Design an enzyme around this catalytic site. Structure first.
Site, short mmCIF file in Angstrom:
data_model
loop_
_atom_site.label_atom_id
_atom_site.label_comp_id
_atom_site.label_asym_id
_atom_site.label_seq_id
_atom_site.Cartn_x
_atom_site.Cartn_y
_atom_site.Cartn_z
CB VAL A 39 -0.99 -0.15 1.24
CG1 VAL A 39 -1.56 1.26 1.37
CG2 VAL A 39 -1.65 -1.39 1.16
CG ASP A 40 3.82 3.85 -2.78
OD1 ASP A 40 4.13 4.92 -1.91
OD2 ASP A 40 4.47 3.70 -3.93
CB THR A 41 0.10 7.10 0.81
OG1 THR A 41 1.29 7.11 1.72
CG2 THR A 41 -0.94 5.91 1.73
CG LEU B 152 -3.82 -0.38 -3.55
CD1 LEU B 152 -4.53 -1.14 -4.67
CD2 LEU B 152 -4.63 -0.83 -2.31
CG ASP C 181 6.01 7.19 -0.22
OD1 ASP C 181 5.13 6.28 -0.43
OD2 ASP C 181 7.07 7.74 -0.88
#
Lengths: 4, 113, 112, 4
Positions: free
Chosen positions: B21-23, B83, C22
């Site tokens: 999961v990669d914001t 994601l 991040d």
């Protein structure tokens, strides 16, 4: 991370 | 592998894919066995440089919030499938940092893995 | 221009830095006039390739619960400073996607 | 994304  | 936490496994075109999961990722990424590729491409800037990559054709993605159609960047240079914020917005996900790890939670508070 | 959401502003070395939060980053990153550097470096693999970057010397970082000392990667090829899983663990942060954006809160939902 |  990733940017367009 | 698997990727570090936070991670989630989703059915994508009928197969499970375990994503980091990669914001920090604007768009989501497949790294291996992406299925059929479009001939459309995008310039991708990473943390260390940039390169041109192709989009996959459309995939059905089974999100906890309901299945949707999505196209992924095929980035074979990338260490893990990602994601990104494109799908995290559809999931209305929460990501909780607890202990040395991280857990993804859905908009109804259900734990996702 | 700020980085996209989710983002957070923290004091580093006494002055604010606005980071892209991040979860894909193993360690936190500064990008510009980072201050004193260590002689040490790390190999950094990004989405598109890898190469080595230098570690900063230690910095005072003002988190919610108080100051920590932390070192950053200096990555001038990266478009935004990144607050990675290293500091997200120390903050015990939660990241919430709501509407079209995203917010970062503390371990009990307070803003930072 | 960033991996050591």
């Amino acid at each position: 991370x990733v940017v367009x | 592998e698997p990727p570090p936490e936070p991670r989630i496994t989703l059915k994508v075109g009928g197969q499970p894919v375990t994503f980091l999961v990669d914001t920090g990722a604007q768009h989501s990424v497949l790294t291996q066995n992406p299925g059929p590729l479009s001939d459309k491409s995008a310039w991708v800037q990473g943390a260390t440089g940039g390169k041109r990559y192709r989009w996959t054709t459309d995939r059905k993605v089974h999100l906890a919030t309901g299945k949707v159609t999505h196209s992924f960047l095929h980035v074979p240079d990338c260490p893990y499938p990602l994601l990104g914020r494109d799908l995290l917005t559809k999931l209305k996900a929460q990501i909780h940092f607890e202990g040395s790890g991280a857990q993804v939670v859905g908009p109804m508070g259900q734990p996702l893995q």
